[PDB]
Specification:
The structure is cut from a larger assembly and holds 4 copies of chain A.
Chain A (H helix, E strand, L loop, with lengths): L36 H6 L3 E6 L11 E6 L11 E4 L4 H5 L6 H11 L2 H15 L5 H16 L12 E4 L4 H8 L3 H8 L6 E4 L2 E3 L8 E3 L2 E3 L56 E4 L2
Parallel strand pairs in A: 5-9
Antiparallel strand pairs in A: 1-2, 3-8, 4-9, 5-6, 7-8
Helix pairs in contact in A: 3-4
Chain lengths: 279, 279, 279, 279
């Protein structure tokens, strides 16, 4: 597939796709997220990070992890990274989104009546472009089937096991998430303790997120101040005012002489659960 | 679509497709049957005919109709042109058919466990060709969705109405046929009386087939003796002996002088039901 | 006004207006119909004729009259030239008409909820073209106000009087027609007896139409066989079959020698009512 | 629109428009008042001010606010900035105003009989200039429709909310003001406390006006002494004597040395109500 992004087929009527930041080449490769960096940052409010695991030789067991983009000052529906069926409409703000985005999200969450009424309202557009709708639906449905744990092929790797907490509520809630949402969640949060073969590698002793009935949240108020490089960039006649935290400083307080050491950026990777890798 | 035939993606492991008679270019065009002439003759035992309706000027309202290939001498599961879910396994003889054909037929008739066990037995082949199965399933499923009366698009033309008899049992049985089977049946049998606009054109006063609980049958013993030009043509070490009817004759009995008149071949087109075409 | 046609502002999203036959220059001039020849023929199924009244000198008191386009063989909702509020939706077949046409017709007939839901469904288009809707509504509303007998200016000519029958039901029904419909009806049907000054000119002793509760109809089965020169001309995948009447003939039956006399075409002008012109 | 002023189409019979001070270019732009500075000062006795809201960076959230032109010494119908339907005739002194101004004001306040009798008395002028009246009415009516909260388009922004007091009488009276009057009032008085996003900016702790059953008044006797730069300037054979307050002074009392500091003019901006801006 040249485009593994689910939101790759998101087009207006006369489509020079919105893409203020063009979709990254990550959609071309099969890393398993099935979403490009731009769509991940815009919708799920997370970026992609290459988790490197050294072993003392030079080669690193590379992995994909989610990088939080929400700030510690946030509260409410803004702190949720990935919503569940309960309130995803309000979280993703599907009311004013483009009809292709609405369709894609609704049939990812699989609520029949919503895409039914989308088709009813799209019938008027259908007389101009009667071919894009079917191919868009086919591509998105086949992507969902590929990421679906149960299908015809149903490619299953029981050797990898993911635990999202020692409590019953956490995994019982995680069970009812959509198949694509489950696949994205399992492969965006790094394990707390990667159990590989007959040993355990303690990647992190603290969780940077939480899985609950409404989905994946940045529950901990870890301080984050990274700016998204693939911002929406649309002309904002609708103003969103925010409480920015800024400090002053001189050349002495801004210690440039400390810059020669390799930098340890304050990023917020998603760490939760245990990864059981037999053998 | 370059190939509307459902059995277009029927390939062995090393595929130079069986196709003793290559698939006709009818699969390229959208006549609605979604089966090529070779597959229609081999499986459903029918050919395709261009029903021309003159009106006194020269232009003909062309239509597609089914041409029976069964003989009047036949009895049993051989006289059924299209089977239903009841006995399609025995009618189509799926026991010894190629696995692609088995898969296609089973998921056309939508019996989950059969294609499930096909996948289980195909897992061994999967390690050699892990890409053809998914694309084959996707193409066949999208063809079924396109021929499905209910779907996302669900392109419906209520203006055309098809009646398959004045009895309750006939249409009640026709209702439970598969969606693709229903689409093929509605567009292979010519109407007894084509009701178009405010008038009725009596195409035929007699039915040449029957729709029952087991499907579409050549119930009437109409005499048929046309040979299929797209025969299976496979080396037959398994012998099928049949009771052929042959007559002798001289040059006088074989009246060549009668050949100058345009020929009226004894063919058996499928005629049944009434086509209500408002306006 | 460069364009007096009410349907002059009928545009698709990307508008190269449908107009298989371009709108005639009649919309440029103020003849009072406020509809061009193409829109009159397409919707109201009538054409425009120049009624000339000689007086024995050479100058003719020109007038505008409606020419029927329906055939004598017609019956039902097809024989009505102009519908009323009762069944104009079915008469004009507004279900599949373009949204601009639907809006124009609905606010001509003044049924609030219909153009309200048109606006609700047009909100999606509004984000692309937020300026055409307001100007279209303003132009059509000002045209309706100009043709409205009651307004600010309310230009009234009481000297001209129109009678649409000697029965109470006819004029009582004609009273409840829409203002634009009333203006079009009064100035499309020629008077039976033009009462001008102190004399009466008997234009016709027989009525060629009828005004009833559902509007203006071609009640009489007068034989009409003129073809519209401004036909819709759209690619018709939806077939309308009609019962055409045709006769054969040779050169003798087709008397070309009779052609030298000036022709008296069998046309069906709209004649009904009495025109009282004091002085 | 080149001219958003409602009183832009105010012309005498031979029109070189009165405009002792020509209409400002504010009518060209869409600030929402839909009245130019000259007409606002002449009729509503208020000017326009650019309310700048600094935030500590340099950019200012600009807004439009009304500047009072009445003096503290005034009493009676003179202290009302904007009248309601109760006594607008006496407030605006429509008795001797030009007929275009009378028409515009009356159909802004929507009292049918007044513009009806204006049309009756204007019939005599109509024979000379039968085209200006209709276009003037159309332009003014479309301006009122554009400023009308309810219309076909009915462009509504529920996110902005305006409160005109914590008492029931104030907002209940404000409800019955005309649509254009309501739009002008909502966008001429600055909020007491601009509630934006999740914070509140206290612009002013004291109200400089009042909204009552008769409209918008300068209830507080705040001292105002600014002269209008767009005065009526008409030759006044009808004398209006006023009680002017004047003080004497020398060069010492007129401290020119204090002028180097940036001046804080004693102006009277309209401050009342709370502006709720969600997000």
């Amino acid at each position: 597939l040249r485009n593994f992004c689910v939101f790759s087929s998101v087009k207006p009527l006369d489509f020079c796709d919105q893409y203020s930041s063009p979709c990254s080449s990550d959609a071309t490769v099969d890393d398993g997220w099935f979403v490009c960096e731009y769509h991940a940052s815009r919708f799920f409010k997370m970026e992609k990070l290459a988790l490197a695991i050294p072993d003392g030789t030079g080669n690193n067991y590379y992995r994909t992890v989610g990088k939080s983009l929400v700030d510690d000052k946030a509260e409410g529906i803004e702190r949720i990274l990935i919503p569940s069926q309960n309130n995803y409409e309000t979280v993703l703000n599907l009311s004013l989104l483009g009809p292709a985005e609405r369709l894609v999200f609704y049939m990812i969450y699989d609520n029949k009546e919503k895409q039914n009424e989308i088709c009813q309202q799209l019938r008027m557009y259908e007389r101009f472009r009667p071919e894009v709708v079917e191919e868009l639906y086919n591509s998105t449905l086949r992507v969902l089937a590929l990421t679906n744990p149960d299908a015809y092929c149903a490619q299953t790797n029981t050797n990898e096991s993911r635990s999202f907490g020692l409590s019953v509520e956490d995994d019982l809630a995680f069970n009812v998430l959509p198949t694509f949402i489950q696949n994205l969640i399992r492969k965006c949060v790094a394990p707390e303790s990667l159990t590989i073969g007959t040993e355990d590698l303690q990647l992190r002793n603290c969780n940077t997120c939480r899985i609950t009935s409404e989905g994946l949240l940045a529950s901990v108020r870890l301080y984050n101040s990274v700016q998204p490089k693939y911002l929406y960039g649309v002309n904002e006649n609708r103003l969103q005012i925010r409480n920015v935290l800024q400090f002053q400083g001189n050349a002495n307080a801004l210690q440039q002489k400390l810059s020669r050491y390799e930098l340890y950026q304050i990023n917020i990777p998603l760490f939760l659960g245990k990864q059981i890798i037999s053998t």
